[PDB]
């Protein structure tokens, strides 16, 4: 429950992190205009990606590990090959098919890339063609975050709707309609069962759902919790819910009872991103303080 | 602890050296925010200065400038306005002769955008600079269509004094910031001279904010 190592090593306004598939590497995205692949154990960066557009708000590391996607409000999505023969990081193809801002891009697969953008829709993109195989539409507001299933077949997104909508990636169909949010969904995470998920937002409550139930299971609300939630993540075994807040500190709730299990009060600045390793070994916190620190 | 570890240390230090050099190179550039509405004179300001957002870069004397034209975002402003928190100045452009056009006059709704952007908590202390447009035809036409409560003459000088003051009087919590109103003739030679003096007035305050004395 205490900090084992601290990485830091950036300049300004770290927005997002995504854990690598090795459970050791992580990618750090910042508004500076530089993308960094970190390593947790040796605390030394392994790659630096310059950015044509400095404005980035999301990042993606492929579960293969071969590719890294970064986008922005430019409406242009960039996927970089880390392991080029030349050794430099080069953008595979520009991806400009949206009319808003690319709020979140993730990696369903190497060829099939899911991007949630601020054109009130999400679209499945191929690097080979640069065109939308399936486009997911039905959100009133602008989508900001999405959470893929471990199967990477049924995923959900949240917009300025006070609602979340599942999607089916093959036929481009909305699968479920989740409503029950009071405010705008800042971040959403998926339960690695593939059967449930929980979400938090600015309304200072984290809410537990199940995809097949389409019903709120229980709500995580506290009186001292007036600040909003901007990051949620789980444990590999449940019994836990990592959640960063607008109180400049993360917090931990039980997935079943949500007591004051873990108090995470490290960062001075607003915790922008929070992720759990794919084996669940560590907790990673990121913030605009140019700091990266990981606890255990 | 071998050749692999030593070489990894050298690459992880070389990356940080190049990173530090690039950061020091980037820190000199002045960041400017343009919030030009429809018919604000984006073409006029980009000419007089000479799918996503356009980033123009221009050099005046010994100081560079990077203005980020956020245009046609068509999105909720709050989700991305905090991205420009470190931007030194906010440029506003308003047309004056379109007070006979109701789509709820455009002047009144443009004030609300200024009212919202002034009272935001993110921009506690950011200098606000507003420029004007189409003032000549406003003289040619003019009162009752937009601001009948003025209840005075249709003289352009007093009417411009009324509009610019009440646009500046909308400030309620910007007492840290300074509204730098400039009456853009839309044909004046260098209205970046207003910007350069205003941005150096920020910079003089910026140093005096860091010297301790203010």
């Amino acid at each position, epitope marked *: 429950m205490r900090t084992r190592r601290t990485l830091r090593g950036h300049l300004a306004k770290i927005y997002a992190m995504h854990w690598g598939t090795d459970s050791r*590497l992580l990618v750090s995205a910042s508004q500076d205009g530089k993308l960094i692949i970190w390593d947790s154990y040796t605390t030394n960066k392994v790659h630096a990606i310059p950015l044509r557009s400095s404005w980035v708000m999301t990042c993606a590391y492929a579960p293969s590990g071969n590719y890294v996607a970064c986008g922005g409000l430019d409406n242009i999505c960039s996927i970089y090959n880390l392991k080029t023969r030349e*050794g430099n990081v080069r953008v595979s193809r520009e991806l400009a098919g949206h009319t808003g801002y690319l709020s979140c891009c993730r990696f369903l697969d190497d060829n099939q890339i899911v991007t949630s953008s601020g054109d009130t829709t999400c679209a499945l993109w191929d690097i080979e063609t640069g065109q939308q195989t399936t486009t997911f539409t039905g959100h009133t507001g602008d989508v900001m975050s999405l959470s893929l299933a471990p199967d990477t077949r049924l995923f959900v997104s949240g917009a300025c709707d006070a609602s979340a909508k599942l999607w089916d990636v093959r036929e481009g169909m909305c699968r479920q309609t989740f409503t029950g949010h009071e405010s705008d969904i800042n971040a959403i995470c998926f339960f690695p069962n593939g059967n449930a998920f929980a979400t938090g937002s600015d309304d200072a409550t984290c809410r537990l759902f199940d995809l097949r139930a389409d019903q709120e299971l229980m709500t995580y609300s506290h009186d001292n919790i007036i600040c909003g939630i901007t990051s949620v993540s789980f444990s590999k075994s449940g019994r836990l819910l990592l959640a960063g807040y607008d109180d400049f500190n993360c917090n931990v709730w039980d997935a079943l009872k949500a007591d004051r299990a873990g108090v995470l009060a490290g960062h001075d600045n607003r915790v922008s991103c929070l992720g759990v390793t794919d084996d669940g070994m560590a907790v990673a916190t990121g913030s605009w303080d140019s700091f990266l620190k990981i606890w255990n | 602890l*071998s050749a*692999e570890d*030593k*070489a990894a240390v050298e690459r992880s230090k070389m990356i940080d050296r190049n990173l530090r050099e690039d950061g020091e190179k980037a820190a000199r550039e002045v960041k400017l925010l343009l919030l030009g509405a429809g018919e604000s004179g984006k073409s006029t300001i980009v000419k007089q200065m000479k799918t996503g957002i356009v980033e123009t870069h221009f050099t005046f004397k010994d100081l560079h400038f990077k203005m980020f034209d956020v245009g046609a975002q068509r999105s909720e402003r709050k989700k991305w306005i905090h991205c420009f928190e470190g931007v030194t100045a906010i440029i506003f452009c308003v047309a004056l002769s379109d007070y006979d056009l109701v789509l709820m006059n455009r002047m009144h709704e443009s004030m609300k955008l200024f009212d919202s952007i002034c009272n935001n908590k993110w921009f506690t202390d950011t200098s606000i600079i507003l420029f004007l447009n189409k003032k000549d035809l406003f003289e040619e036409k003019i009162l009752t269509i937009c601001y009948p409560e003025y209840a005075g003459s249709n003289t352009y000088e007093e009417a411009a004094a009324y509009i610019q003051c009440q646009f500046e009087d909308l400030n309620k919590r910007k007492d840290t910031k300074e509204i730098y109103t400039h009456f853009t003739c839309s044909t004046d030679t260098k209205n970046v001279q207003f910007v350069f003096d205003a941005v150096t007035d920020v910079i003089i305050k910026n140093n005096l904010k860091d010297c301790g004395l203010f």
Partner: single-chain antibody, 232 residues
């Protein structure tokens, strides 16, 4: 993709000096680590020198200290190495090497053509037999036998294995005991314990011929096996 061409590998007076350099293009040599590897004209690869990407760490071998020097050039994007006091042992077919270093990187992946230079403790690794007659389609095994264990305290060994084709530029087959290199068929696979190591060649055919090598990275001394011919 990448280009490594050595410049002027020729005759040297005994004990003299001569500038040798591998001209380079098409890769981030600024961010890349470089090596030079010698080949005696009959038998034996071993490491010579290493220059870092940031030119901060310089390491030489036992007969490379002082009398050999190294240097680089980033805008022209090439590498130099100056050799003085050249004798019969100093004569070798030196190979210009690039080698990127991080987690999962594949160092010693590409080579040049060579420097044809003719005039006029240490960890010990040896491959078990240097000549094995084979048949194109039956599985064989070859073992590089070290002297001390290769397993680091962090639990992951560092040990790289190589294939030299008959008279041309070599390749890397498997790096750090578990990871196959790009452009290499899966039929080649290394194995062994933390101290003993052996190759599992499966269903070989008529391009695997040539000398085979080990190399480690737990200690800076390499001194790997002198080679193993795999003759038809």
């Amino acid at each position: 993709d990448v280009q490594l061409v050595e410049s002027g590998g020729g005759l040297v007076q005994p004990g003299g000096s001569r500038k040798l350099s591998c001209s380079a293009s098409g890769f981030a040599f600024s961010s890349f680590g470089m090596h030079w590897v010698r080949q005696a004209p009959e038998k034996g690869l071993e490491w010579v020198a290493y220059i870092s990407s940031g030119s901060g760490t310089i390491y030489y071998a036992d007969t490379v200290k002082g009398r050999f020097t190294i240097s680089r050039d980033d805008p022209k994007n090439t590498l130099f190495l100056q050799m003085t006091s050249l004798r019969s042992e100093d004569t070798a077919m030196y190979y210009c090497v690039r080698s990127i270093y991080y987690y999962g990187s594949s160092p010693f992946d590409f080579w040049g053509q060579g420097t044809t230079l003719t005039v006029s403790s240490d960890i010990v690794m040896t491959q078990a037999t240097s000549s094995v007659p084979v048949t194109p389609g039956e599985s064989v095994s070859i073992s590089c036998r070290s002297s001390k264990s290769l397993l680091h305290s962090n639990g992951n060994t560092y040990l790289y294995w190589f294939l030299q084709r008959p008279g041309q530029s070599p390749q890397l087959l498997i790096y750090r005991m578990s990871n196959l290199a790009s452009g290499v068929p899966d039929r080649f696979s290394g194995s062994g314990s933390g101290t003993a190591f052996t190759l599992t060649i499966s269903r070989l055919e008529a391009e695997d011929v040539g000398v085979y090598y080990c190399m480690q990275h737990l200690e800076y001394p390499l001194t790997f096996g002198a080679g193993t011919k795999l003759e038809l």
